[PDB]
């Protein structure tokens, strides 16, 4: 408990392409880099020589592969993959010293799913069976892991942003990865890691919306999404308030919609003109909340691959949503995030690695008194 030195720094990534962990599948073990995704629940790996993949799962080389004789077709808003289901032995080399028999979707056809130039070749969905494809009888990886071994039912993520890196602690918490205290918010329902936001402030100024609008139709903690997505109505209010706060410079309208970048001369980004963003989350106790606060360092994302420009360019990474709030890497890179499945709660603490400056830091503060927090959930 509290110290897992072998798992620290077991994540890597490149800006814009997400965080992955090394895993091995099959016997003899095949090593693959696997995107860590708390917003889905299938373990699905490339299994055919797609041109974007550095490597892929070759089932014929595995003596322990067992075919389930069942296909799965999985469309997303943008991507799709289709694959064949089976089980095989899986380990995490920088992980607990255990091997489990897990479900694996061997992806045989995909579109807009893999990223050209990325170093991962499959996804590890860490959310619950309720959103597994094709249905909830396909047991997710973490469920199998906890069933089959003595690993405690919790994991924790420290995503360190910009090469990016971080730690996924499987079965526990490493107190070196955060400062101050953890504050916990309840998992409202076990499908996505669904939470309830009860108040939103921009530079300490409350948006004063009906708090149900913050969770319309849900709010989730999602390591497989870059941005902070906000329900459209809330996005509209948030942007207006952020524009107002930063209005000491004028940026094209398109910037705020993520339709264009903004660039400054190297090392001169005016961080100070941009506001902090605070989300108050439902706490553990009736009428009690806490707040997490992020900086423009989290929500202005560096864009490196800009052959059009000499300068430091940034994308605004808060965006409007039709799927509810998504606390993606923009929120997670500020904090150490504990997915305490055993107690159905998510903890937040200020991350020891988050990017900040000499004036401001990400913050997790409590308690606050917030009434009618149960009304904030959308049904
Ligand atoms: C299954 C799915 C998914 C995520 C990513 N993720 C990424 O490619 C990515 C890219 C950058 C970051 C960051 N930071 C995180 N993830 C790539 C393919 C995917 F199919 N998972 C989530 N959560 O929602 C979208 C959904 F499509
Ligand atoms: Na167990
Ligand atoms: Na600590």
């Amino acid at each position: 408990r509290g110290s897992f030195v072998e798992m620290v720094d077991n994540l890597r990534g490149k800006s814009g392409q997400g965080y992955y962990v090394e895993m091995t599948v099959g016997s003899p073990p095949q090593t693959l880099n696997i995107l860590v995704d708390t917003g889905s629940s299938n373990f699905a790996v490339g299994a055919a020589p797609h041109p974007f993949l550095h490597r892929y799962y070759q089932r014929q080389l595995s003596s322990t592969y067992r075919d389930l004789r069942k296909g799965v077709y999985v469309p997303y808003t943008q991507g799709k993959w289709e694959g064949e289901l089976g089980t095989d032995l899986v380990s995490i080399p920088h992980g607990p010293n255990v091997t489990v028999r897990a479900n694996i979707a061997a992806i045989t056809e995909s579109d807009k799913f893999f990223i050209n130039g990325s170093n991962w070749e499959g996804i590890l969905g860490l959310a619950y069976a309720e959103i597994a494809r094709p249905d909830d009888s396909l047991e997710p990886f973490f469920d199998s892991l906890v069933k089959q071994t003595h690993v405690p039912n919790l994991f924790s993520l420290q995503l360190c942003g910009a090469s990016v890196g971080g730690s996924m602690i499987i079965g526990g918490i490493d107190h070196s990865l955060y400062t101050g205290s953890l504050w916990y918010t309840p998992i409202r329902r076990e499908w996505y890691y669904e939470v309830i936001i009860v108040r939103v402030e921009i530079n300490g100024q409350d948006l004063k919306m009906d708090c149900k609008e913050y969770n319309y139709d849900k709010s989730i903690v999602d390591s497989g999404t870059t941005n902070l997505r906000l329900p459209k109505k809330v996005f509209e209010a948030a942007v207006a308030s952020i524009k107002a706060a930063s209005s000491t410079e004028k940026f094209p309208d398109g910037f705020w919609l993520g339709e264009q970048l903004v660039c400054w001369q190297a090392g001169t980004t005016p961080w100070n003109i941009f506001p902090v963003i605070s989300l108050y989350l439902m706490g553990e106790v009736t009428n009690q909340s806490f707040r997490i606060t992020i900086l423009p360092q989290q929500y202005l994302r560096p864009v490196e691959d800009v052959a059009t420009s000499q300068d430091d360019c940034y994308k605004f990474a808060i965006s409007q949503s039709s799927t509810g709030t998504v606390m993606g890497a923009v929120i997670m890179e500020g904090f150490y995030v504990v997915f305490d499945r055993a107690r159905k709660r998510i903890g937040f603490a200020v991350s020891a690695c988050h990017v900040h400056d000499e004036f401001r830091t990400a913050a997790v503060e409590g308690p606050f008194v917030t009434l009618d927090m149960e009304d904030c959930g959308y049904n």
Side-chain angles (χ1 to χ4, degrees):
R1 300 176 50 91
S3 182
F4 292 84
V5 60
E6 69 282 2
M7 303 193 247
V8 167
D9 206 30
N10 65 353
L11 301 184
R12 294 149 66 199
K14 288 203 280 295
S15 272
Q17 303 184 334
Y19 295 78
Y20 55 83
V21 67
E22 185 182 298
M23 299 185 74
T24 64
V25 301
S27 306
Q30 304 173 36
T31 299
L32 303 164
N33 288 328
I34 303 294
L35 174 83
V36 173
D37 182 17
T38 65
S40 69
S41 299
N42 282 80
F43 179 35
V45 307
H50 187 285
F52 296 176
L53 296 178
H54 284 85
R55 45 213 147 251
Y56 51 96
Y57 176 32
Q58 288 188 104
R59 286 167 293 167
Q60 73 279 8
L61 303 180
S62 178
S63 55
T64 43
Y65 176 70
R66 297 179 185 164
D67 196 334
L68 286 170
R69 298 184 192 64
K70 195 166 138 86
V72 63
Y73 183 96
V74 180
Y76 291 112
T77 307
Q78 134 166 288
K80 65 107 206 182
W81 58 263
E82 165 165 54
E84 298 169 4
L85 298 172
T87 67
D88 204 341
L89 298 189
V90 177
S91 306
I92 298 175
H94 302 291
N97 196 222
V98 294
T99 297
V100 301
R101 177 161 296 270
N103 295 308
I104 309 177
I107 297 171
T108 48
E109 192 159 35
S110 62
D111 190 77
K112 296 186 181 197
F113 176 75
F114 298 119
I115 294 167
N116 191 20
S118 79
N119 201 35
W120 49 269
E121 46 273 346
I123 185 164
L124 177 60
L126 289 169
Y128 300 94
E130 174 70 7
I131 59 173
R133 279 79 149 143
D135 57 61
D136 62 0
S137 75
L138 197 78
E139 174 176 277
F141 175 75
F142 202 92
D143 295 69
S144 308
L145 174 64
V146 173
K147 269 215 206 213
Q148 287 176 42
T149 73
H150 293 294
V151 174
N153 191 21
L154 98 167
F155 68 84
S156 61
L157 293 178
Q158 189 203 51
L159 302 186
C160 303
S163 262
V164 294
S167 298
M168 181 177 45
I169 313 295
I170 289 126
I173 291 164
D174 187 310
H175 307 300
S176 84
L177 299 181
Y178 67 92
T179 57
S181 185
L182 288 159
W183 281 83
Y184 290 94
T185 191
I187 294 168
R188 186 192 189 195
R189 180 178 154 207
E190 287 154 300
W191 55 321
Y192 295 96
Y193 284 106
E194 181 185 355
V195 300
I196 294 174
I197 294 166
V198 303
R199 178 185 160 99
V200 178
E201 286 174 355
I202 303 299
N203 255 8
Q205 294 234 258
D206 185 336
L207 290 182
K208 291 184 208 159
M209 305 189 58
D210 162 19
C211 57
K212 202 177 298 269
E213 302 278 358
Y214 306 136
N215 309 285
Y216 171 52
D217 58 292
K218 57 191 181 291
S219 292
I220 68 170
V221 184
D222 188 357
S223 67
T225 297
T226 300
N227 283 4
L228 178 55
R229 305 226 301 265
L230 298 171
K232 182 179 178 75
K233 220 171 263 181
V234 168
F235 177 78
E236 286 172 357
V239 148
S241 170
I242 296 169
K243 288 179 159 164
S246 64
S247 73
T248 230
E249 298 178 41
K250 251 67 228 251
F251 308 111
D253 277 341
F255 167 69
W256 297 111
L257 293 177
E259 292 175 354
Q260 67 195 263
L261 300 188
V262 65
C263 310
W264 294 271
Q265 204 184 227
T268 72
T269 308
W271 295 112
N272 330 110
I273 72 169
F274 293 97
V276 302
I277 300 170
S278 299
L279 301 181
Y280 289 67
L281 296 176
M282 184 183 273
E284 292 193 285
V285 175
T286 285
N287 283 341
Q288 169 263 321
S289 65
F290 65 96
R291 63 165 190 240
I292 68 176
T293 295
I294 56 166
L295 304 185
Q297 286 89 338
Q298 278 73 63
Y299 69 77
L300 294 201
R301 315 289 291 174
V303 186
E304 181 56 81
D305 85 297
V306 75
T308 303
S309 199
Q310 284 322 262
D311 295 333
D312 297 351
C313 307
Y314 292 94
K315 185 147 178 224
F316 185 57
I318 302 175
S319 59
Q320 57 185 355
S321 183
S322 50
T323 61
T325 292
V326 188
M327 306 166 59
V330 164
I331 287 293
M332 290 182 73
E333 287 174 2
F335 303 104
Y336 182 50
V337 185
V338 177
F339 295 79
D340 184 348
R341 293 163 52 109
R343 291 173 283 215
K344 284 185 74 184
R345 63 182 185 175
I346 294 171
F348 289 82
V350 174
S351 168
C353 71
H354 84 277
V355 178
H356 55 86
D357 59 40
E358 66 199 61
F359 301 98
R360 285 187 304 197
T361 161
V364 180
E365 292 160 276
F368 293 94
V369 182
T370 307
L371 297 223
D372 296 330
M373 291 190 295
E374 304 290 335
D375 298 354
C376 301
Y378 180 73
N379 287 298

